[PDB]
Design a binder for these strands. Structure first.
Ligand code: ZN
Lengths: 43, 48, 100, 112
RNA sequence: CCGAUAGUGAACCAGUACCGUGAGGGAAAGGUGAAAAGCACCCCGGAAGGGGAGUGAAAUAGAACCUGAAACCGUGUGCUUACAAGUAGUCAGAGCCCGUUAAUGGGUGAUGGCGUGCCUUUUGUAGAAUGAACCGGCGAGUUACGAUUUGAUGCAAGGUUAA
RNA sequence: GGGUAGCGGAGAAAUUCCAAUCGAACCUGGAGAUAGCUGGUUCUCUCCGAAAUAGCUUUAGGGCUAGCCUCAAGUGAUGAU
RNA sequence: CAAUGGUAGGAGAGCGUUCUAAGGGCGUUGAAGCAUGAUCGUAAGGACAUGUGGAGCGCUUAGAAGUGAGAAUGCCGGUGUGAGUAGCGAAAGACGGGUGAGAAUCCCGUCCACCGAUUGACUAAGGUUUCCAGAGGAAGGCUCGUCCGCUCUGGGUUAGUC
């Protein structure tokens, strides 16, 4: 059976990722939130 | 299909009354004073 | 601390108390001088790369500096130490006699 | 007098070691060496080098005479268990126990 | 005020293993000894493990290393048991084995009498109505303000202050 | 390789699919939503000790007042046979 | 002299647990905790002796509370029963020699089998050192293991035209 999640390096970085996040006002809110929690990776 | 009560320790040790093993035949060898199984070769200077 | 690497001291605690000795190394971070002849040790000298199988290797172990007290030179008995400024520098004095 | 030997955390379930110890309990050590090397069970090679080490402790450390030595006590104690898993049919796991054993063997010349 | 199931999620290389495409969710895990003085050397074994010797007050204080409960798993034994119908006890009671916080003692137990768990919920449960596999931890009428009633204390035609 | 996003998309139409989910996805917050319903609520002795009935109620497996219990301070034979 | 069965409930008197005040005590000649015992009080409960343990802890009067568990298809840990039971994941091996403490299972040989529009050869994506050579056998491997995609310490990817 085909499963969800067929991985894809370039799709992964265009939908989730630093520049995509820093493009929207709500994406910068995600990254602010993860910084005050102290996550080791932000995106 | 599934146990209705647990098994007590008493009832478990009675079922295991017969779960044991016996020693082998294991006679002494005439060539070397030793021990070997009956009707098999000796594992010590193999003679028969 | 208040004891240096050359002073001769007495031991006022431990099982080797009442012994006069000389100081040979201080170890100030953990506060434990190594006096000569006190606190003898028995280490198992294993076979080394450039040594033999050995035996027991006698040596000295550190001692807490609170179990030691200097010796004023005149009377030769234990005493605390103070300071008085002379020659522009700091100077140890024996609290019951003159300078060290 | 008595002499002792132990093997700690031998990776065999204590139920399985115990079948073979009930064969040599109270036997003369010359006959029990042969029972263990003429038996087909997995613990037999392990148990007999606990038995030979106890006979060696008897002659070297205690100056005994191996001819009249006997197996006085032989037992297996539960050692600590490892935790493992087995995947099952529809997303669920089940528990495996990897159980160990402490083994003790006492020999004695039977005197006082 | 807490004292390692507590106190921060985190006393420890914690927003970390790990889980999720992502937003996000989110642990477990402290203690050698005063001092490493951390077991030279011999013996069995391929090693692991062990028995001695030694260091130390102490080594079941030997690195999962303060103490070490219960459930559970064993080894040895004193009394008992293969004609018997058991909610497993209790009251009566021989025979045998022991000897105390020394008092009309302790262990076992042939045989006799009488005896259908506990909780919850119900008119009524041995219930074939509910819940619990066992052991351990820890898990539910608090205290702020206001009202009322009772006790107890000061003062009394007066009593009492708030910021 | 791209685009359509939940008070929304997509649908040769089945209440079908939108990350093993869909009569309205998932995650965080308001938040200890509310729960006249079920389940739990932990030491010991002593004294007393009942109700499953009126009446009203979008009210009958809920509630309120009275009837029946207790404790205290009064009244003083007014209770029973 | 008289009273004393008791659920829902009302009322009274107490036992024990942590912390504080004041007073007075005990502890390396061994405190607390733990274990065992044939002891004491009307109950909740209190002592004493020994064993282990290694530094703190009771008593009296008063005060203050995260103050007492057998039940919640309770929460977390760790141990049973079922039980030496089910299973051990599509398909063919045999023998000889060798290596080793240990061989059905590792290496070499011969024969036999199986796929062959594929169980062969390439290559995108994806994965990121699994690649190679020496060494190892704790755990992983559904058995074993002297072996390994596992552990150890040394290496390995070369472009004007792909
Ligand atoms: Zn022979």
């Amino acid at each position: 059976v085909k499963r969800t999640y067929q991985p894809n390096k370039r799709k992964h970085s265009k939908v989730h990722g630093f520049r995509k996040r820093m493009s929207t006002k709500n994406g910068r809110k995600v990254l602010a939130r993860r910084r005050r929690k102290g996550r080791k990776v932000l995106s | 299909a599934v146990p209705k009560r647990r098994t007590s320790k008493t009832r478990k040790n009675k079922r295991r009354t017969h779960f044991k093993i016996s020693v082998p035949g294991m006679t002494e060898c005439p060539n070397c004073g030793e021990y070997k199984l009956s009707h098999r070769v000796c594992k010590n200077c193999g003679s028969y | 601390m208040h004891i240096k690497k050359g002073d001769n001291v007495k031991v006022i605690a431990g099982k080797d108390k009442g012994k006069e000795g000389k100081v040979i190394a201080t170890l100030p971070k953990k506060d434990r001088v190594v006096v000569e002849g006190v606190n003898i040790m028995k280490k198992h000298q294993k076979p080394t790369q450039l040594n033999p199988e050995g035996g027991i290797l006698e040596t000295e172990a550190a001692i807490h500096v609170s179990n030691v007290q200097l010796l004023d030179p005149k009377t030769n008995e234990p005493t605390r130490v103070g300071y008085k400024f002379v020659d522009g520098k700091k100077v140890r004095i024996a609290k019951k006699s003159g300078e060290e | 007098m008595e002499a002792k030997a132990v093997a700690r955390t031998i990776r065999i379930a204590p139920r399985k070691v115990r079948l073979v110890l009930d064969l040599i309990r109270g036997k003369n050590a010359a006959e029990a060496i042969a029972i263990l090397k003429l038996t087909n069970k997995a613990s037999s090679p392990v148990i007999e080098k606990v038995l030979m080490s106890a006979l060696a402790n008897a002659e070297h450390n205690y100056d005994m005479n191996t001819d009249e030595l006997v197996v006085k006590e032989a037992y297996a104690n539960e050692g600590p268990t490892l935790k493992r898993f087995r995947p099952r049919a529809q997303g669920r796991a089940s528990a495996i126990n990897k159980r160990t054993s402490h083994i003790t063997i006492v020999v004695s010349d039977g005197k006082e």
